[PDB]
Ligand binder design. Structure first.
Ligand SMILES: C[C@H](OP(=O)(O)OC[C@@H](O)[C@@H](O)[C@@H](O)Cn1c2nc(=O)[nH]c(=O)c-2cc2ccc(O)cc21)C(=O)N[C@@H](CCC(=O)N[C@@H](CCC(=O)O)C(=O)O)C(=O)O
Length: 109
């Protein structure tokens, strides 16, 4: 069905590597993911990690990408959110059901 990417972040507290599966969008070299966490009240821990340490590793099939993660700008949100929703309509439901704006993370080389 929908492929997952494996995102590795550095635990902001422990400094240990943390891996989590996510759905993703490609924009050339960029990988885009949404810190939706099924519409939880709070941002997922991996998001907190990458905001404390922007260096992340992303594995897609056999490709291992060393990228730098940051929040999408207003204009990037406008471009990527609708693509994310088209690919996985549940994203819009999560956003509908949660207070926080769901972060969109741009991972770039
Ligand atoms: C519960 C927590 O996970 P989390 O980082 O909040 O991630 C929540 C979810 O987003 C994560 O489980 C995703 O993989 C769920 N998930 C998706 N989550 C998404 O947000 N978006 C997706 O598109 C998505 C797709 C998906 C597909 C398949 C699947 O099985 C899961 C999918 C966790 O793993 N707990 C760790 C925390 C590890 C950690 O980062 N700790 C930090 C400190 C954190 C802190 O400061 O409190 C550290 O080591 O220092 C632990 O306690 O052992």
């Amino acid at each position: 069905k929908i492929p997952v990417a494996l995102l590795t972040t550095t635990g902001r507290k422990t400094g240990q590597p943390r891996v989590n599966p996510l759905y993703f969008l490609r924009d050339g070299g960029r990988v885009i993911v949404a810190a939706s966490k099924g519409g939880a009240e709070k941002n997922p821990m991996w998001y907190l990690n990458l905001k404390a340490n922007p260096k992340v590793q992303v594995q897609i099939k056999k490709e291992v990408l060393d990228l730098t993660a940051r929040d999408a700008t207003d204009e990037e949100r406008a471009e990527y959110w609708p693509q994310l929703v088209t690919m996985y309509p549940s994203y819009q439901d999560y956003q509908s059901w949660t207070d926080r704006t769901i972060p969109i993370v741009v991972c770039e080389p």
